[PDB]
């Protein structure tokens, strides 16, 4: 995982999802990729 | 700096209502003086200059009523409530394109 | 949604019983949204769910079909629960008639599995416990949830059975949590054909 301020898709399998958003926080934007786990990225700091 | 002059960057809906009514009040003074003379077939150079290069409150854009041109601002615009004695001074026209 | 429009073919034996709009009083909330109790009974068992009221079911008993529809496609909440409520009914119908199954494969030298009874930790009389020898120092035993049938045709093959897919697939993830597949040798617990790409060396 890499926490960038500018997350981008690096292949055709990379998906942009917002996870960890619940009634207590807003969550982060994630780049999830099942093909290459090196494309895992996050946007924002806890 | 350290001296706090707490001036917000934008005006409230209550200040805007009075800025609109102050521009519309200066139009009645120029419309009363311009019609009072026309009945006598007379004219003034300052009354003809105003009507030529100055718009009415109904012809101004919202950004020309609540903002002025400041070359030191990022987008060359500044709140009109930042001008000295802005409540008793006329300011309707800004440089073209800005 | 394109899935909520598809009618739901009710196979022979499956019986759907739609309730009436009701509201359970909640002292914590000033207004609860009405729901509808839907029962789907059949040969293997009975499942129930409470759907929002805005979802309308056209239960055709003549042709044994039931199509869903929402009162407003413009609302994001109604578009979402439309496709979701349809996906659950599809599982409920195909879970009470045929049933849901999950196959787990144990890869790795020394990985076994047996279905034995542990009367000490029985949560309900006759509970089955899956005992896994996953190269641990301690034994791993997990009681099958009430409603599921677990069997081991082979030492390295578990077979879970149940009418509730969410319950069957959620219990298979608990077994897989002990040994997640690795990318170097393929050792771990694979659930329903799951595969892992290996490395060159």
């Amino acid at each position: 995982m890499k926490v960038h301020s500018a997350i981008k898709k690096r292949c055709e399998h990379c998906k942009v999802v917002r996870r960890k958003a619940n009634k207590r926080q807003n969550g982060y934007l994630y780049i999830i990729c099942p093909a290459n786990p090196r494309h895992k990225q996050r946007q924002g700091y806890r | 700096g350290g001296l706090l002059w707490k001036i917000p960057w934008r005006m409230s809906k209550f200040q805007k209502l009075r800025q609109r009514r102050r521009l519309r009040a200066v139009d009645n003074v120029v419309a009363t003086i311009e019609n009072a003379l026309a009945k006598k077939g007379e004219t003034v150079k300052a009354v003809e200059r105003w009507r030529a290069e100055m718009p009415t409150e109904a012809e101004m854009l919202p950004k020309d009523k609540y903002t002025i041109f400041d070359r030191k601002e990022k987008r060359y615009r500044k709140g009109i409530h930042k001008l000295p004695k802005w409540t008793r001074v006329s300011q309707r026209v800004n440089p073209p394109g800005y | 949604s394109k899935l909520g429009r598809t009618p739901l073919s009710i196979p022979p034996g499956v019986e759907i019983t739609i309730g009436e709009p009701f509201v359970k009083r909640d002292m914590t909330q000033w207004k609860q949204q009405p729901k509808r109790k839907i029962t789907v009974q059949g040969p293997l068992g009975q499942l129930e769910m409470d759907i929002p009221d805005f979802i309308k079911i056209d239960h055709d008993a003549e042709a044994r079909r039931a199509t869903l529809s929402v009162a407003n496609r413009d609302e994001k909440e109604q578009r979402e629960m439309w496709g979701t409520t349809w996906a659950y009914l599809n599982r409920f119908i195909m879970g009470v008639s045929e049933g849901h199954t999950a196959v787990l494969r144990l890869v790795g030298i020394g990985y076994r599995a047996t279905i034995d009874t542990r009367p000490e930790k029985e949560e309900y009389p006759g509970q089955q416990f899956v005992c896994l020898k996953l190269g641990f120092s301690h034994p791993v035993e997990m009681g099958v949830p009430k409603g599921m049938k677990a069997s081991t045709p082979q030492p390295t093959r578990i077979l879970l059975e149940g009418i509730n897919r969410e319950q069957v697939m959620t219990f298979a993830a608990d077994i897989r949590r002990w040994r997640v597949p690795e990318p170097y040798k393929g050792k771990g617990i694979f659930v329903n054909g799951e595969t892992i790409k290996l490395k060159q060396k």
């Binding site: 009634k23 207590r24 | - | 002292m27 000033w30």
Partner: protein, 183 residues
């Protein structure tokens, strides 16, 4: 001066009012249509109305120095209405002048330790004048979680119908018609 000369006994009496935090309030709700969307009075909008009653600012004889406030019984405070995500994101802070002894608690956790009545009192407290009558006035706010309370006999009545009951308005008008039959 004649307007004030007379018996002001009943103008200074303490009236026991009642409001439910769950009943939709058409006047204190921001959603005014449709009829089914009318919500109850929010926490801060229910607190601003209560603070007005605690101060007696609803009477024609109000004086900030004279303690002419009334009682307010608030029921069903467990179903206190809030908007957005305040319940799980609003924080209440507290300090005892010792560095490091800062206490934080969210509305949902403060509603578990001391119920929803504590969240209402903290709101009505900040809406009262900060003076020596503050704790007297705030003490007249009797907030409960359910429908039960010990003041079911103190609630103001008109002809046997508690105000806020189904048919209290008709009982009030039936007594004013009998009053006008005199000089």
């Amino acid at each position: 001066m004649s307007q004030t000369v007379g018996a002001t006994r009943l103008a200074y009496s303490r009236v026991w009012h009642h409001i439910s935090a769950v009943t939709p309030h058409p006047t204190l709700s921001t959603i005014k249509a449709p009829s089914e969307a009318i919500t109850p009075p929010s926490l801060g909008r229910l607190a601003s109305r209560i603070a007005t009653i605690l101060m007696g600012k609803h009477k024609p004889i109000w004086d900030p120095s004279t303690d002419c406030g009334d009682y307010v019984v608030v029921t069903n405070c467990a179903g206190l209405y809030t908007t957005g995500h305040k319940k799980w994101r609003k924080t209440y802070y507290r300090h005892n002048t010792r560095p490091g002894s800062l206490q934080a608690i969210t509305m949902d956790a403060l509603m578990e330790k001391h119920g929803g009545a504590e969240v209402l009192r903290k709101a009505v407290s900040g809406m009262l004048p900060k003076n020596r009558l503050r704790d007297k006035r705030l003490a007249r706010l009797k907030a409960f979680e359910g429908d039960a309370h010990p003041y079911k006999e103190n609630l103001v009545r008109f002809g046997g119908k508690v105000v806020g009951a189904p048919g209290w308005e008709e009982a009030v008008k039936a007594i004013r018609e009998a009053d006008m039959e005199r000089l």
